[PDB]
Amino acid sequence: ATWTCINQQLEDKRLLYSQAKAESNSHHAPLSDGKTGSSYPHWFTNGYDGNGKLIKGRTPIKFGKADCDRPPKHSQNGMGKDDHYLLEFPTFPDGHDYKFDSKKPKENPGPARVIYTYPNKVFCGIVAHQRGNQGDLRLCSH
């Protein structure tokens, strides 16, 4: 399965990702909420607060997997014993594994992220930043 993302750069850029490479990246990623050099992986809010309430005006991305569409439970540190939430990790057309402990310099994460679950690492989808490498995330197609 090939996912296509559109990202604007300093103009619209079309980027293709192999679903297999991305699933492999998330499996290799630690199950941690940002307690790494690069800050990745980290909680992907999808518009909710840590109690599972949808923030007003925000719209969640629908993935189509019950595991991914359930509201989260995220304690302050992402380690409460009842926690279950989404994680985001950088993914690339080449499939290389992002250096999550990289700090000065921090590896460029690019615009795309593989979204998966904590604690079971279920694959949700590939999303990408609209412009550059931060800001609004949009689900890529396939």
Side-chain angles (χ1 to χ4, degrees), residues 36-63:
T36 60
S38 73
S39 86
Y40 291 102
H42 70 71
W43 183 32
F44 163 64
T45 64
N46 202 15
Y48 294 93
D49 78 0
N51 277 310
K53 287 111 66 204
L54 215 231
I55 301 299
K56 167 171 69 57
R58 299 262 258 142
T59 296
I61 288 173
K62 200 235 300 176
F63 299 102

PDB file of all heavy atoms in Angstrom, residues 36-63:
ATOM      1  N   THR A  36      12.836  11.199  25.286  1.00  0.00           N
ATOM      2  CA  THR A  36      13.938  10.901  24.364  1.00  0.00           C
ATOM      3  C   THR A  36      14.573  12.209  23.962  1.00  0.00           C
ATOM      4  O   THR A  36      13.989  13.282  24.141  1.00  0.00           O
ATOM      5  CB  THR A  36      13.399  10.240  23.044  1.00  0.00           C
ATOM      6  OG1 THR A  36      12.491  11.124  22.381  1.00  0.00           O
ATOM      7  CG2 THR A  36      12.672   8.959  23.351  1.00  0.00           C
ATOM      8  N   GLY A  37      15.768  12.104  23.385  1.00  0.00           N
ATOM      9  CA  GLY A  37      16.497  13.281  22.976  1.00  0.00           C
ATOM     10  C   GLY A  37      15.817  14.179  21.987  1.00  0.00           C
ATOM     11  O   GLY A  37      15.849  15.378  22.181  1.00  0.00           O
ATOM     12  N   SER A  38      15.164  13.598  20.985  1.00  0.00           N
ATOM     13  CA  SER A  38      14.494  14.345  19.939  1.00  0.00           C
ATOM     14  C   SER A  38      13.063  14.808  20.251  1.00  0.00           C
ATOM     15  O   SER A  38      12.499  15.613  19.506  1.00  0.00           O
ATOM     16  CB  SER A  38      14.437  13.483  18.682  1.00  0.00           C
ATOM     17  OG  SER A  38      13.467  12.424  18.813  1.00  0.00           O
ATOM     18  N   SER A  39      12.462  14.252  21.300  1.00  0.00           N
ATOM     19  CA  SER A  39      11.069  14.496  21.703  1.00  0.00           C
ATOM     20  C   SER A  39      10.106  13.536  20.989  1.00  0.00           C
ATOM     21  O   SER A  39       8.883  13.609  21.189  1.00  0.00           O
ATOM     22  CB  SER A  39      10.640  15.948  21.510  1.00  0.00           C
ATOM     23  OG  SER A  39      10.175  16.201  20.183  1.00  0.00           O
ATOM     24  N   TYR A  40      10.637  12.685  20.104  1.00  0.00           N
ATOM     25  CA  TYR A  40       9.840  11.690  19.406  1.00  0.00           C
ATOM     26  C   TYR A  40      10.151  10.285  19.970  1.00  0.00           C
ATOM     27  O   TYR A  40      11.284  10.039  20.391  1.00  0.00           O
ATOM     28  CB  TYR A  40      10.114  11.700  17.870  1.00  0.00           C
ATOM     29  CG  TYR A  40       9.628  12.912  17.160  1.00  0.00           C
ATOM     30  CD1 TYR A  40      10.527  13.895  16.802  1.00  0.00           C
ATOM     31  CD2 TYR A  40       8.260  13.072  16.865  1.00  0.00           C
ATOM     32  CE1 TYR A  40      10.109  15.027  16.161  1.00  0.00           C
ATOM     33  CE2 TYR A  40       7.802  14.209  16.226  1.00  0.00           C
ATOM     34  CZ  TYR A  40       8.741  15.190  15.892  1.00  0.00           C
ATOM     35  OH  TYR A  40       8.392  16.413  15.414  1.00  0.00           O
ATOM     36  N   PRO A  41       9.147   9.375  20.067  1.00  0.00           N
ATOM     37  CA  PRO A  41       7.755   9.636  19.674  1.00  0.00           C
ATOM     38  C   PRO A  41       7.072  10.454  20.764  1.00  0.00           C
ATOM     39  O   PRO A  41       7.629  10.621  21.857  1.00  0.00           O
ATOM     40  CB  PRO A  41       7.147   8.224  19.568  1.00  0.00           C
ATOM     41  CG  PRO A  41       8.009   7.359  20.452  1.00  0.00           C
ATOM     42  CD  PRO A  41       9.387   7.931  20.349  1.00  0.00           C
ATOM     43  N   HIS A  42       5.912  11.010  20.453  1.00  0.00           N
ATOM     44  CA  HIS A  42       5.173  11.732  21.445  1.00  0.00           C
ATOM     45  C   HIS A  42       3.683  11.625  21.156  1.00  0.00           C
ATOM     46  O   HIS A  42       3.248  11.217  20.071  1.00  0.00           O
ATOM     47  CB  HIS A  42       5.660  13.213  21.575  1.00  0.00           C
ATOM     48  CG  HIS A  42       5.329  14.085  20.397  1.00  0.00           C
ATOM     49  ND1 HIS A  42       4.043  14.506  20.101  1.00  0.00           N
ATOM     50  CD2 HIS A  42       6.137  14.647  19.474  1.00  0.00           C
ATOM     51  CE1 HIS A  42       4.085  15.298  19.039  1.00  0.00           C
ATOM     52  NE2 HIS A  42       5.343  15.397  18.646  1.00  0.00           N
ATOM     53  N   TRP A  43       2.907  11.901  22.201  1.00  0.00           N
ATOM     54  CA  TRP A  43       1.465  11.904  22.125  1.00  0.00           C
ATOM     55  C   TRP A  43       0.957  12.746  20.959  1.00  0.00           C
ATOM     56  O   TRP A  43       1.407  13.868  20.734  1.00  0.00           O
ATOM     57  CB  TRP A  43       0.931  12.407  23.490  1.00  0.00           C
ATOM     58  CG  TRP A  43      -0.528  12.412  23.642  1.00  0.00           C
ATOM     59  CD1 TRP A  43      -1.403  11.544  23.085  1.00  0.00           C
ATOM     60  CD2 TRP A  43      -1.306  13.347  24.420  1.00  0.00           C
ATOM     61  NE1 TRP A  43      -2.695  11.870  23.465  1.00  0.00           N
ATOM     62  CE2 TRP A  43      -2.670  12.964  24.282  1.00  0.00           C
ATOM     63  CE3 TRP A  43      -0.992  14.467  25.204  1.00  0.00           C
ATOM     64  CZ2 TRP A  43      -3.737  13.663  24.908  1.00  0.00           C
ATOM     65  CZ3 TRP A  43      -2.063  15.165  25.824  1.00  0.00           C
ATOM     66  CH2 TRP A  43      -3.422  14.741  25.659  1.00  0.00           C
ATOM     67  N   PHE A  44       0.011  12.185  20.217  1.00  0.00           N
ATOM     68  CA  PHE A  44      -0.622  12.860  19.101  1.00  0.00           C
ATOM     69  C   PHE A  44      -1.991  13.036  19.703  1.00  0.00           C
ATOM     70  O   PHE A  44      -2.729  12.030  19.854  1.00  0.00           O
ATOM     71  CB  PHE A  44      -0.682  11.904  17.876  1.00  0.00           C
ATOM     72  CG  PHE A  44      -1.664  12.331  16.787  1.00  0.00           C
ATOM     73  CD1 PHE A  44      -1.496  13.517  16.074  1.00  0.00           C
ATOM     74  CD2 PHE A  44      -2.734  11.529  16.465  1.00  0.00           C
ATOM     75  CE1 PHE A  44      -2.383  13.851  15.087  1.00  0.00           C
ATOM     76  CE2 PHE A  44      -3.607  11.868  15.481  1.00  0.00           C
ATOM     77  CZ  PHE A  44      -3.427  13.009  14.804  1.00  0.00           C
ATOM     78  N   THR A  45      -2.366  14.297  20.008  1.00  0.00           N
ATOM     79  CA  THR A  45      -3.663  14.544  20.647  1.00  0.00           C
ATOM     80  C   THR A  45      -4.909  14.265  19.844  1.00  0.00           C
ATOM     81  O   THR A  45      -5.908  13.884  20.438  1.00  0.00           O
ATOM     82  CB  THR A  45      -3.831  15.951  21.201  1.00  0.00           C
ATOM     83  OG1 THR A  45      -3.797  16.863  20.132  1.00  0.00           O
ATOM     84  CG2 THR A  45      -2.699  16.336  22.126  1.00  0.00           C
ATOM     85  N   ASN A  46      -4.853  14.504  18.530  1.00  0.00           N
ATOM     86  CA  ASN A  46      -5.955  14.305  17.599  1.00  0.00           C
ATOM     87  C   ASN A  46      -7.141  15.176  18.030  1.00  0.00           C
ATOM     88  O   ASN A  46      -8.285  14.830  17.788  1.00  0.00           O
ATOM     89  CB  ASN A  46      -6.380  12.845  17.512  1.00  0.00           C
ATOM     90  CG  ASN A  46      -7.092  12.555  16.240  1.00  0.00           C
ATOM     91  OD1 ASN A  46      -7.025  13.351  15.304  1.00  0.00           O
ATOM     92  ND2 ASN A  46      -7.774  11.415  16.175  1.00  0.00           N
ATOM     93  N   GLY A  47      -6.855  16.276  18.715  1.00  0.00           N
ATOM     94  CA  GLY A  47      -7.904  17.166  19.157  1.00  0.00           C
ATOM     95  C   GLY A  47      -8.521  16.896  20.525  1.00  0.00           C
ATOM     96  O   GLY A  47      -9.461  17.594  20.876  1.00  0.00           O
ATOM     97  N   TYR A  48      -8.006  15.932  21.316  1.00  0.00           N
ATOM     98  CA  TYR A  48      -8.582  15.637  22.622  1.00  0.00           C
ATOM     99  C   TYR A  48      -7.664  16.101  23.720  1.00  0.00           C
ATOM    100  O   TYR A  48      -6.468  16.344  23.458  1.00  0.00           O
ATOM    101  CB  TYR A  48      -8.705  14.120  22.820  1.00  0.00           C
ATOM    102  CG  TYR A  48      -9.677  13.448  21.915  1.00  0.00           C
ATOM    103  CD1 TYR A  48      -9.255  12.901  20.697  1.00  0.00           C
ATOM    104  CD2 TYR A  48     -11.026  13.380  22.244  1.00  0.00           C
ATOM    105  CE1 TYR A  48     -10.163  12.302  19.811  1.00  0.00           C
ATOM    106  CE2 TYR A  48     -11.935  12.783  21.387  1.00  0.00           C
ATOM    107  CZ  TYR A  48     -11.500  12.238  20.171  1.00  0.00           C
ATOM    108  OH  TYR A  48     -12.382  11.567  19.343  1.00  0.00           O
ATOM    109  N   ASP A  49      -8.215  16.214  24.942  1.00  0.00           N
ATOM    110  CA  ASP A  49      -7.396  16.472  26.136  1.00  0.00           C
ATOM    111  C   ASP A  49      -7.043  15.110  26.778  1.00  0.00           C
ATOM    112  O   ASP A  49      -7.538  14.078  26.330  1.00  0.00           O
ATOM    113  CB  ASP A  49      -8.083  17.475  27.112  1.00  0.00           C
ATOM    114  CG  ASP A  49      -9.200  16.877  27.970  1.00  0.00           C
ATOM    115  OD1 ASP A  49      -9.539  15.673  27.901  1.00  0.00           O
ATOM    116  OD2 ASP A  49      -9.738  17.672  28.774  1.00  0.00           O
ATOM    117  N   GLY A  50      -6.236  15.082  27.826  1.00  0.00           N
ATOM    118  CA  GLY A  50      -5.833  13.830  28.459  1.00  0.00           C
ATOM    119  C   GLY A  50      -6.912  13.041  29.152  1.00  0.00           C
ATOM    120  O   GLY A  50      -6.697  11.938  29.597  1.00  0.00           O
ATOM    121  N   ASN A  51      -8.089  13.625  29.251  1.00  0.00           N
ATOM    122  CA  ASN A  51      -9.220  12.974  29.881  1.00  0.00           C
ATOM    123  C   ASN A  51     -10.167  12.423  28.842  1.00  0.00           C
ATOM    124  O   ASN A  51     -11.236  11.949  29.195  1.00  0.00           O
ATOM    125  CB  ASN A  51     -10.006  13.960  30.734  1.00  0.00           C
ATOM    126  CG  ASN A  51      -9.424  14.141  32.105  1.00  0.00           C
ATOM    127  OD1 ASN A  51      -9.146  13.158  32.827  1.00  0.00           O
ATOM    128  ND2 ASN A  51      -9.272  15.398  32.503  1.00  0.00           N
ATOM    129  N   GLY A  52      -9.848  12.553  27.565  1.00  0.00           N
ATOM    130  CA  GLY A  52     -10.771  11.991  26.594  1.00  0.00           C
ATOM    131  C   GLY A  52     -11.891  12.883  26.097  1.00  0.00           C
ATOM    132  O   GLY A  52     -12.773  12.420  25.389  1.00  0.00           O
ATOM    133  N   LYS A  53     -11.834  14.152  26.433  1.00  0.00           N
ATOM    134  CA  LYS A  53     -12.810  15.125  26.001  1.00  0.00           C
ATOM    135  C   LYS A  53     -12.290  15.837  24.767  1.00  0.00           C
ATOM    136  O   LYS A  53     -11.130  16.253  24.725  1.00  0.00           O
ATOM    137  CB  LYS A  53     -13.025  16.166  27.097  1.00  0.00           C
ATOM    138  CG  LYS A  53     -13.822  15.657  28.317  1.00  0.00           C
ATOM    139  CD  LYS A  53     -12.950  15.543  29.591  1.00  0.00           C
ATOM    140  CE  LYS A  53     -12.448  16.926  30.088  1.00  0.00           C
ATOM    141  NZ  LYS A  53     -11.193  16.867  30.922  1.00  0.00           N
ATOM    142  N   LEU A  54     -13.144  15.944  23.762  1.00  0.00           N
ATOM    143  CA  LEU A  54     -12.852  16.605  22.494  1.00  0.00           C
ATOM    144  C   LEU A  54     -12.793  18.124  22.773  1.00  0.00           C
ATOM    145  O   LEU A  54     -13.666  18.648  23.424  1.00  0.00           O
ATOM    146  CB  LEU A  54     -13.959  16.260  21.489  1.00  0.00           C
ATOM    147  CG  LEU A  54     -13.672  16.064  20.005  1.00  0.00           C
ATOM    148  CD1 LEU A  54     -14.635  16.912  19.257  1.00  0.00           C
ATOM    149  CD2 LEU A  54     -12.265  16.442  19.624  1.00  0.00           C
ATOM    150  N   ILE A  55     -11.718  18.804  22.387  1.00  0.00           N
ATOM    151  CA  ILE A  55     -11.586  20.241  22.652  1.00  0.00           C
ATOM    152  C   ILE A  55     -12.545  20.923  21.693  1.00  0.00           C
ATOM    153  O   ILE A  55     -12.702  20.476  20.569  1.00  0.00           O
ATOM    154  CB  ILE A  55     -10.122  20.740  22.360  1.00  0.00           C
ATOM    155  CG1 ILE A  55      -9.080  19.997  23.211  1.00  0.00           C
ATOM    156  CG2 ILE A  55     -10.043  22.271  22.420  1.00  0.00           C
ATOM    157  CD1 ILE A  55      -9.220  20.148  24.683  1.00  0.00           C
ATOM    158  N   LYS A  56     -13.203  21.996  22.136  1.00  0.00           N
ATOM    159  CA  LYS A  56     -14.155  22.766  21.302  1.00  0.00           C
ATOM    160  C   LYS A  56     -13.524  23.396  20.073  1.00  0.00           C
ATOM    161  O   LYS A  56     -12.538  24.115  20.204  1.00  0.00           O
ATOM    162  CB  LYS A  56     -14.820  23.892  22.137  1.00  0.00           C
ATOM    163  CG  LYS A  56     -15.580  24.943  21.307  1.00  0.00           C
ATOM    164  CD  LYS A  56     -16.445  25.961  22.123  1.00  0.00           C
ATOM    165  CE  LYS A  56     -15.633  26.996  22.988  1.00  0.00           C
ATOM    166  NZ  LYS A  56     -14.594  27.907  22.329  1.00  0.00           N
ATOM    167  N   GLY A  57     -14.118  23.144  18.903  1.00  0.00           N
ATOM    168  CA  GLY A  57     -13.634  23.698  17.654  1.00  0.00           C
ATOM    169  C   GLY A  57     -12.666  22.779  16.921  1.00  0.00           C
ATOM    170  O   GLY A  57     -12.356  22.988  15.730  1.00  0.00           O
ATOM    171  N   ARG A  58     -12.177  21.754  17.608  1.00  0.00           N
ATOM    172  CA  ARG A  58     -11.241  20.827  17.008  1.00  0.00           C
ATOM    173  C   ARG A  58     -11.938  19.631  16.400  1.00  0.00           C
ATOM    174  O   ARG A  58     -12.995  19.185  16.879  1.00  0.00           O
ATOM    175  CB  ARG A  58     -10.230  20.409  18.046  1.00  0.00           C
ATOM    176  CG  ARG A  58      -9.444  21.595  18.560  1.00  0.00           C
ATOM    177  CD  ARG A  58      -8.153  21.613  17.813  1.00  0.00           C
ATOM    178  NE  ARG A  58      -7.095  21.087  18.649  1.00  0.00           N
ATOM    179  CZ  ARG A  58      -6.083  20.313  18.252  1.00  0.00           C
ATOM    180  NH1 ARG A  58      -5.943  19.885  17.004  1.00  0.00           N
ATOM    181  NH2 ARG A  58      -5.208  19.940  19.152  1.00  0.00           N
ATOM    182  N   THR A  59     -11.340  19.112  15.331  1.00  0.00           N
ATOM    183  CA  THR A  59     -11.910  17.966  14.601  1.00  0.00           C
ATOM    184  C   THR A  59     -10.926  16.782  14.491  1.00  0.00           C
ATOM    185  O   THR A  59      -9.861  16.887  13.879  1.00  0.00           O
ATOM    186  CB  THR A  59     -12.370  18.419  13.162  1.00  0.00           C
ATOM    187  OG1 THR A  59     -13.434  19.384  13.283  1.00  0.00           O
ATOM    188  CG2 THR A  59     -12.854  17.209  12.302  1.00  0.00           C
ATOM    189  N   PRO A  60     -11.273  15.657  15.117  1.00  0.00           N
ATOM    190  CA  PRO A  60     -10.366  14.518  15.031  1.00  0.00           C
ATOM    191  C   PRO A  60     -10.271  13.893  13.621  1.00  0.00           C
ATOM    192  O   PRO A  60     -11.215  13.947  12.790  1.00  0.00           O
ATOM    193  CB  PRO A  60     -10.972  13.512  16.023  1.00  0.00           C
ATOM    194  CG  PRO A  60     -11.887  14.318  16.893  1.00  0.00           C
ATOM    195  CD  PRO A  60     -12.435  15.358  15.960  1.00  0.00           C
ATOM    196  N   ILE A  61      -9.109  13.319  13.349  1.00  0.00           N
ATOM    197  CA  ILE A  61      -8.898  12.594  12.107  1.00  0.00           C
ATOM    198  C   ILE A  61      -9.542  11.237  12.370  1.00  0.00           C
ATOM    199  O   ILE A  61      -9.374  10.667  13.437  1.00  0.00           O
ATOM    200  CB  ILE A  61      -7.370  12.401  11.816  1.00  0.00           C
ATOM    201  CG1 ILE A  61      -6.742  13.730  11.402  1.00  0.00           C
ATOM    202  CG2 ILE A  61      -7.136  11.423  10.678  1.00  0.00           C
ATOM    203  CD1 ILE A  61      -5.221  13.628  11.273  1.00  0.00           C
ATOM    204  N   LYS A  62     -10.320  10.742  11.427  1.00  0.00           N
ATOM    205  CA  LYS A  62     -10.938   9.445  11.582  1.00  0.00           C
ATOM    206  C   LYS A  62     -10.040   8.449  10.828  1.00  0.00           C
ATOM    207  O   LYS A  62      -9.786   8.644   9.655  1.00  0.00           O
ATOM    208  CB  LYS A  62     -12.328   9.488  10.958  1.00  0.00           C
ATOM    209  CG  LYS A  62     -13.278   8.393  11.432  1.00  0.00           C
ATOM    210  CD  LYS A  62     -13.862   7.563  10.263  1.00  0.00           C
ATOM    211  CE  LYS A  62     -14.675   8.386   9.238  1.00  0.00           C
ATOM    212  NZ  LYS A  62     -15.123   7.533   8.083  1.00  0.00           N
ATOM    213  N   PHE A  63      -9.552   7.410  11.503  1.00  0.00           N
ATOM    214  CA  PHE A  63      -8.695   6.404  10.888  1.00  0.00           C
ATOM    215  C   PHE A  63      -9.449   5.191  10.376  1.00  0.00           C
ATOM    216  O   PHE A  63      -9.047   4.614   9.394  1.00  0.00           O
ATOM    217  CB  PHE A  63      -7.558   5.967  11.831  1.00  0.00           C
ATOM    218  CG  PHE A  63      -6.622   7.097  12.215  1.00  0.00           C
ATOM    219  CD1 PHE A  63      -6.731   7.727  13.476  1.00  0.00           C
ATOM    220  CD2 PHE A  63      -5.626   7.517  11.337  1.00  0.00           C
ATOM    221  CE1 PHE A  63      -5.848   8.761  13.854  1.00  0.00           C
ATOM    222  CE2 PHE A  63      -4.733   8.543  11.697  1.00  0.00           C
ATOM    223  CZ  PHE A  63      -4.849   9.174  12.972  1.00  0.00           C
TER     224      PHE A  63
END
